[PDB]
Amino acid sequence: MGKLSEQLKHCNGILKELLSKKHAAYAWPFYKPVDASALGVHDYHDIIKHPMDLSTVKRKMENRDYRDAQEFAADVRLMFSNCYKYNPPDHDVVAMARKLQDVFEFRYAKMP
Numbered sequence: 001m002g003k004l005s006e007q008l009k010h011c012n013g014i015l016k017e018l019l020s021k022k023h024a025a026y027a028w029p030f031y032k033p034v035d036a037s038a039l040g041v042h043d044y045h046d047i048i049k050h051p052m053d054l055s056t057v058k059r060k061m062e063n064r065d066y067r068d069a070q071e072f073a074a075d076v077r078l079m080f081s082n083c084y085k086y087n088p089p090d091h092d093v094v095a096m097a098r099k100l101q102d103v104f105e106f107r108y109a110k111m112p
């Protein structure tokens, strides 16, 4: 697959951290694709045109889909944006998204 660039190594590090046990209390809703039928949210795919989640980001990293850090970051941010778009701002899952995005943005800012 070829060695990840230095910046994408940092991105992969961030991804591993987001999936790690220390953040699980607020990261878990973002681990896998939203299953709209399972959750009973039958309007989800009318509202969210481009679903994203951490397992999909991980697959894309493993498959070398991301050509740079910017592309990676856009997907992680898309995941958070979908959450902010679908849910009311006072929902528990939105608070969790904000917390995980704080973890993400502060470490992404430490890009070599």
Ligand SMILES: CC[C@@H](C(=O)OC)[C@@H]1N=C(c2ccc(Cl)cc2)c2ccc(OC)cc2-n2c(C)nnc21
Binding pocket: 028, 029, 030, 032, 033, 034, 035, 039, 040, 041, 044, 082, 083, 086, 087, 092, 093
């Ligand atoms: C799908 C919409 C929303 C919902 O109303 O579910 C019933 C959902 N809430 C939740 C959610 C609701 C309350 C709390 Cl405390 C945590 C997550 C949700 C749950 C599981 C899951 O994957 C297994 C994804 C979730 N998620 C994400 C991401 N963004 N919005 C949600």
Ligand SMILES: C[C@H](O)COC[C@H](C)O
Binding pocket: 098, 101, 102, 105, 106
């Ligand atoms: C809570 C906002 O939607 C995202 O905040 C990012 C900041 C680094 O906490």
Ligand SMILES: [Cl-]
Binding pocket: 073, 074, 077
């Ligand atoms: Cl972006």
